[PDB]
């Protein structure tokens, strides 16, 4: 009754990437029990961004479809919600660090995101805007030290046909005691469905579903 079959969200992000300061404000909506969501984002400070939008898109776990037999840590955390901290280590030394708060206010999810990105090479695909969206990912979720930890090897498509990899670690922490699942996998596909000419208005789509592992966690 706390999380309805349809839920909206608002997101505010503040960040710096290689020293470039920016802010994003957005609104999203989706069906949390179906693993479907969309969002429309606006760059409100620092636009147009001089780097690939794709590094920001993975910066909304309440909208993961969980089978009944896998406890849903994220949904169970509400109304209080949860928080997360993440490091994304890109293969060329680029690094993004993130904090996030997820709350429920006035019947919608509220996401506050703070991030810092550094060491993206000036001639690399992020600063040269040569990326073309993320391949589908498998986030391996593990209960550890009283939290849920996620690990991902993520692959960003490049305009030239190759891929640019990021090793991701996240700690997700509920704001109250919640039943922890065993270790499991969240399958994720995120698309940038539309954008204006300078990526100051961007729309995203994401589908996510939890599953049991088959081969070793």
Residue numbers in the entry: 6 to 64, 69 to 226
What's the paper's own text on this?
Recently, three OFPs with novel phenotypes have been developed: permanently fluorescent LSSmOrange with a large Stokes shift (437 nm, 572 nm) and two proteins photoswitchable from orange to far-red fluorescent states PSmOrange ( 548 nm, 565 nm; photoconverted form 636 nm, 662 nm) and PSmOrange2 ( 546 nm, 561 nm; photoconverted form 619 nm, 651 nm). LSSmOrange and PSmOrange have been engineered from mOrange and PSmOrange2 has been engineered from PSmOrange using directed molecular evolution. Electron density maps show that LSSmOrange, PSmOrange, and PSmOrange2 have the same chromophore structures as parental mOrange. It consists of p-hydroxyphenyl, imidazolinone, and 2-hydroxy-dihydrooxazole rings.
Monomeric PSmOrange2 has been developed as an improved version of PSmOrange with faster and more efficient photoswitching. Analogously to PSmOrange, in PSmOrange2, position 64 is occupied by Leu pointing out at the importance of a hydrophobic residue in this position. PSmOrange2 differs from PSmOrange by total six substitutions, only two of which, F65I and A217S, are located close to the chromophore. Replacement of aromatic F65 (present in both mOrange and PSmOrange) by aliphatic I65 is accompanied by a dramatic decrease of the amount and intensity of light required for an efficient photoconversion. Replacement of aromatic F65 with aliphatic I65 and decrease of the light energy required for photoswitching imply that I65 facilitates backbone cleavage and decreases the activation barrier of photoconversion. S217 in PSmOrange2, forms a strong H-bond with catalytic E215 and both, S217 and E215, adopt two conformations. In conformation “A”, the side chain of S217 is oriented away from E215 and forms a H-bond with the main chain carbonyl of Y72. This makes E215 move away from the chromophore, causes break of a H-bond between Oε2 atom of E215 and N2 atom of the chromophore (4.4 Å), and provides formation of a new H-bond between the side chains of E215 and Q42. In conformation “B”, S217 points towards E215, forming a strong H-bond (2.6 Å) with its side chain and pushing E215 closer to the chromophore, facilitating H-bonding between E215 and nitrogen of imidazolinone ring (3.1 Å) that connects it with the protein matrix. Substitution A217S in PSmOrange2 induces the shift of E215 closer to the chromophore and cause formation of its H-bond with N2 atom, increasing polarization of the chromophore and its quantum yield.
